[PDB]
């Protein structure tokens, strides 16, 4: 309904889906007056290095 | 270095084209639409002499 190509019929007769090139959004945690910070990758297992 | 193509007699265009009604007293100017043909194409020959 949102005018996006959900899938495709290829020339071999094999149908395929395409969704997105999803990449992990990142948040940062930081503490004032102790100059320390760390990074969080949400909704993803520890797979992206 | 290209002579195989031919050339027409002369350039020509339609400076005035109109429709006259049955009363022969009211004049309708013509408008050509996007990628269409005027009614005056049906009345003007291939070349204007």
């Amino acid at each position: 309904a949102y005018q996006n190509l959900v899938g495709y019929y290829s020339d071999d007769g094999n149908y395929y889906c395409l969704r997105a090139c999803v990449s992990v959004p990142v948040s940062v945690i930081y503490d004032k007056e102790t100059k320390t910070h760390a990074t969080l990758f949400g909704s993803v297992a520890c797979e992206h290095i | 270095n290209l002579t195989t193509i031919t050339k027409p007699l002369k350039y020509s265009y339609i400076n005035k084209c109109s429709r006259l009604l049955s009363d022969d007293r009211t004049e309708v100017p013509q408008l050509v639409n996007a990628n269409q043909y005027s009614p005056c194409v049906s009345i003007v020959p291939s070349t204007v002499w």
Partner: protein, 49 residues
């Protein structure tokens, strides 16, 4: 080939499901003027339709 007809008698060539190459086509043209509205002049060379 042929004779280029008049401006009010223009010949239209339509292309669907084939291959074009303006590299072998625009080179043989002595183009006086090259304007492209709502589109770049290089878009017709590369982008597919």
């Amino acid at each position: 080939s042929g004779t280029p007809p008049q401006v009010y008698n223009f010949k239209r060539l339509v292309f669907t499901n084939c291959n074009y190459n303006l590299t072998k086509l625009l080179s043989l043209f002595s183009v006086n003027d090259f304007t492209c509205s709502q589109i770049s002049p290089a878009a017709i060379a590369s982008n597919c339709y």
